[PDB]
Amino acid sequence: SYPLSKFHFSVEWGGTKIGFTEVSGLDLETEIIEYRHGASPEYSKIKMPGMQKFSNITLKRGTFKSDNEYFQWYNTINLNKVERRDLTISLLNEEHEPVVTWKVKNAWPLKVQSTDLKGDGNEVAIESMELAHEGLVIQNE
Amino acid sequence: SYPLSKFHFSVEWGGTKIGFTEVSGLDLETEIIEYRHGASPEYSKIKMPGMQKFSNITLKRGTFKSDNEYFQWYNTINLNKVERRDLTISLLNEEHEPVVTWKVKNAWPLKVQSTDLKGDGNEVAIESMELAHEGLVIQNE
Amino acid sequence: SYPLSKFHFSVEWGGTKIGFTEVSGLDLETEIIEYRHGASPEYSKIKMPGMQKFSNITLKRGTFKSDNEYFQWYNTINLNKVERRDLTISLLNEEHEPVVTWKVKNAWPLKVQSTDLKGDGNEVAIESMELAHEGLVIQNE
Amino acid sequence: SYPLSKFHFSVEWGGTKIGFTEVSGLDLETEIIEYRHGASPEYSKIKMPGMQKFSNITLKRGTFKSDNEYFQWYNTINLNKVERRDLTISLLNEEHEPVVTWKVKNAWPLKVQSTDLKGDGNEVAIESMELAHEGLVIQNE
Amino acid sequence: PSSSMAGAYARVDNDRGVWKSPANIGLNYVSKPSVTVSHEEQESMNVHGTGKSVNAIRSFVGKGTLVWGARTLAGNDNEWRYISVRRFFNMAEESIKKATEQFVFEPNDGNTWVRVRAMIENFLILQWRAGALAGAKPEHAFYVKVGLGQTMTAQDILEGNMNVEIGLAVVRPAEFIILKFSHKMQ
Amino acid sequence: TYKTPGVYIEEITKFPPSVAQVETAIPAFIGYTQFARTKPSVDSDDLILKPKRISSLLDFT
Amino acid sequence: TYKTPGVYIEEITKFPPSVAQVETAIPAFIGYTQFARTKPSVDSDDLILKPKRISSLLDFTTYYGGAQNEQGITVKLTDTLIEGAENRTINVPEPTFKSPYLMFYSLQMYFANGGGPCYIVSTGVYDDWSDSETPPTINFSDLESGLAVIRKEDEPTLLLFPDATNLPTDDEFYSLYNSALMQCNDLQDRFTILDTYSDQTYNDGVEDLDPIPALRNGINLTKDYLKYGAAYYPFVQTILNYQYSADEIVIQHLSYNPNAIATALDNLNAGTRLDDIIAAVSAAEPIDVNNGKLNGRLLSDIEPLDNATYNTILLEINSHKVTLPPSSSMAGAYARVDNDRGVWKSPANIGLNYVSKPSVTVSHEEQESMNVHGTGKSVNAIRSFVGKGTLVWGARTLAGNDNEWRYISVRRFFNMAEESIKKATEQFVFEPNDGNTWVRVRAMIENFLILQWRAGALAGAKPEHAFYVKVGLGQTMTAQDILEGNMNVEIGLAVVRPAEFIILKFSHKMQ
């Protein structure tokens, strides 16, 4: 009778750790094609589905001693070659088991962003990555 | 078990001092090439890596008596010639030793910005510089 | 109650693959013969059908490793001899079955055009071919 | 499963350097001969291959100190004599090895074009050359 | 002819794909078959009471020596009579187990079951996209199932077993074309 | 039934076939036939009083 | 058992599995199994009369086994000529003798339609056949025993009997159902699902009887019992196959050109007793003027002779499907409605899974006497709709003229609410009988009912119009009740009933 919360989750991306600070961009989108012939009694258009799009996925985590994984994956790019991975994102229950799963096909990294530095910057250094992919399936049983 | 903080760092740029107020722009970026042939069962495109880009780096420091270094480096520009330098940026531990290092190739200055003046400006005069470069490597062992 | 879209199609040309980026030139044209005798009350001409023409067909595809088919077909020309083929072009439904078919008789290639090269050319290398033929029939049942 | 990109390539032309900004004109073309006898049931013509043509090739590069090669090759023309060369153009993989090769027979230069000069011309001085030749073979294995 | 056929199998896999029949292929460096096989003579080679079919090498006018027929030694088998079906399955099975080996020493629980399932489905989607599997959408081409109460019981969890069930829709070839002629009339 | 892969040739005389897709005009036809069966190899007439849907003249036959 | 770490590969054929989580619709199933054990390695049947809870079909199989093999399948093959060409027909008739044991098939349909956990009560194990034309029988006394057993369990809400239609007489069938309705009346927490004896005219041994009148005369209990159950008609055709073995199937082979005897001789001719056999056989060559080469052999023995025949026959056997009474499908359907819409909504206008079609077509006019009848003994119909498939049409109880209890959803809603409340009141059983307790009990009950109202189960703009709860000395109790230790609580509820008829009217629009 109650909705799910948004703070207990995990990400499987081929790296050593599965803990993240922030995950965003899990969207699906379709184009519209419009039409009207001149003899129609209505003065508006009829609509049908076009081609499909996906958004890029952003992942954020804190920087730790001796963990250089964002860089190492990015550095697998060689002219048109890159290591592609299966990305699995999951929202967890009180037993730490999956409830809602987002399945992502053929991901690789477009960009890796490092932290800024400040003399009075009393906070955690956070690094982030942006991923391209070829498709998303949502499972909730 | 704890992440790194963001306020203890140093910059080696060929100048007399290594202390800075602010450092930003340590980014990496790759272009995407998209494709779809007409007979495909999927109505979306396949993606692969393109050409690469780097962002400019911004450095900020307080103005001190008898230190004219930002200007002196900028003033080495002569038609197409300029003094190019190796820039090393490092995040430090409690012994004041490097933990995370950003290595920058062939840097030189695009612009030097001076301070504004105000009659009621009860604050420190801060000067800044923007640098062009040809590549970034990230080391975290 | 809705019109057909223009992005899901296939081409059968005797090659290993049927996927193309672009297809154009599927036209039909007839000449006019005009006449007026001097005693007519009208001061304009009467018109009737003349001889018939067809346009050349252009096909565009991306370049792939180890596929040299455009060249191999072109290279079958020997003084006045060439391998002639039956070309079938089809617009597909959601089951990937034909809806509208264009049937082309006795085709062969007039020209094969290669890709340009650019230092900052962040895009796909596209090759193209232009075909001569002797007739077109349109089927839509 | 992916097409080739268009920015990594090299040109062997007998000069000291193999790097170019732009390459274009790698085309092949055949003429058509048409015929109809008066008794035919069809009111259109039958087509067959004629004589063959080739396009000129254009090469573009930046001007460098002490490199006068475009001029030196052009200056080998003496009444009807000229130094003719074998031109090899190649599209490269990630190991910097050939993938697609264009082989050109008996080339020599029709024209050499110099750069324009502008007071506010904040850009690279680019020189170019146009080449005549006697034949093109395309290799992609 | 066995080494020539191994060569021919490699050519088909590269130009058309492992899911297409290894037949109607011309052979290189072959002058002719040593024995001529007629149309009627092949009827008992393709179809026979024992199911032990034999494929024929035949000479065609204007084409040269071709491989004619692509059945297995179990020719009356409703599921396995075609070579391309058996070979497609062997390929898919080998590729999937290589992919699943990365999970061998992982905990046997819901987190693993989800990761394994997602990996297998992504593989099959790509095979579908390339035209190897039948179906308008992936939903009609295959399924993957795993879970306690679906494929596993309490006893399997205790013994360390994990059970995954997979099903595939595979396309089969036509063998016969019949033409009919008549005199056109009103 | 054919046993050898290939192209077979036959010579026949008939009118060409015709089919259509119709949603709003579906008739029922009540009358006598040569036989009425569900399978080609049966020992009787299975469909004497059972309605059946037919898509074309070939299905009827 | 595996010994080497790694990935193993197997090739099997089956339908994919299905499970569900269900809280308010737990059935019990009473009938026969292959075996009944608690451990895989025992010397006997441990669970013959012991209720057990099962979460899925795999758990069932683990302790009870599968279906019985059919022994009524035969095959007939005939060889003829068409204008000199060979042509043969292979015919596999529907069996006329079938195994009487349906629990396995019943459970497959139950889970296919969304059922959750359930109780299994064995009554015994499968018996054998006496001959190919003489199947096992169902013993009435075994089903009564199973019913007596389930009576002691608290969790079940629905009662089903998968092998009741195979009882030797209709009288035994009706007797079993009258007992089930009486159990529901005594316990006040169960509902039964009923089938007719047959979906076709049955032979009493003295008269031909129509199944609907049959059931109406068969069940002769009054209103107090009829309100606890409902019946459905006709039977349905599923997509499930039969279980069998090629070793049990014999082929008849007839031919335009006979050769059964000649074949036997060629093999026999390939020591004293062998000579006698051959002579006896050769004597028959003039007799057999109809039978071909394969006549008299089993499927499993002809595969090497002609595996085209062997394979064709198996394919034809596979075309025959299983036909079942609809009660297990309905138990599944009840669970789906409770989860998606709620127990207060009618269990109708529901599509069934794994159903090809109803066995008998019911027209519009033909259903009028099923929904409304002078006796009130209504029957719900299973009907085929164009573009929709097979739907459950109607949701009345066996007391169809009852102003308070004619709808299934009203009876089921009340049973649910009553069960939940008494569980909540048990915590107060040994408390002092005074004002402090009376207040605590009342407050607890009202909070439950407010939540049911908030969720849309009860009628009324505000809780004040949906229900009331009363308790107190001078209101519900007297001095005598206090002395004897009694406590009396009165509760009333406003419950919503469905519409059944929609009437459209058409006209020509005019000024």
Numbering used by the authors:
A (entry chain 4a), B (entry chain 4b), C (entry chain 3a), D (entry chain 3b): 2 to 142
E (entry chain 3A): 505 to 690
F (entry chain 3F): 3 to 63
G (entry chain 4F): 3 to 272, 450 to 690
What does the paper say about this structure?
Six protofilaments of sheath proteins adopt a right-handed helical array with a length of 92.4 nm and an outer diameter of 24.6 nm. Unlike the multiple sheath proteins present in PVC/AFP, the AlgoCIS sheath is composed of only one protein, Alg2, which folds into four domains. The conserved domains I and II contribute to the sheath wall, with additional domains III and IV extending outwards. The sheath subunits are interwoven with each other via a conserved ‘handshake’ and iteratively assemble into the full sheath, where the attachment helix in domain I mediates the interactions with the inner tube. Interestingly, depending on its location in the different sheath layers, Alg2 exhibits pronounced structural variations. The hinge angles of domain IV were also observed to be different when comparing the different Alg2 layers. A lowpass-filtered map indicates that there are two potential conformations of domain IV in the central sheath layers. The inner tube subunits possess the conserved β-barrel structures and the N terminus of Alg1 is shorter than that of Pvc1 and Afp1.
CISs are macromolecular injection devices with an overall structure that is homologous to the contractile tails of bacteriophages. Their conserved modules include an inner tube, a contractile sheath and a baseplate complex. For firing of the extended apparatus, the baseplate undergoes a conformational change and triggers sheath contraction, which in turn causes the inner tube to be expelled and injected into a target. Here we performed structural and mechanistic studies on a clade Ib CIS gene cluster in the marine bacterium Algoriphagus machipongonensis PR1.
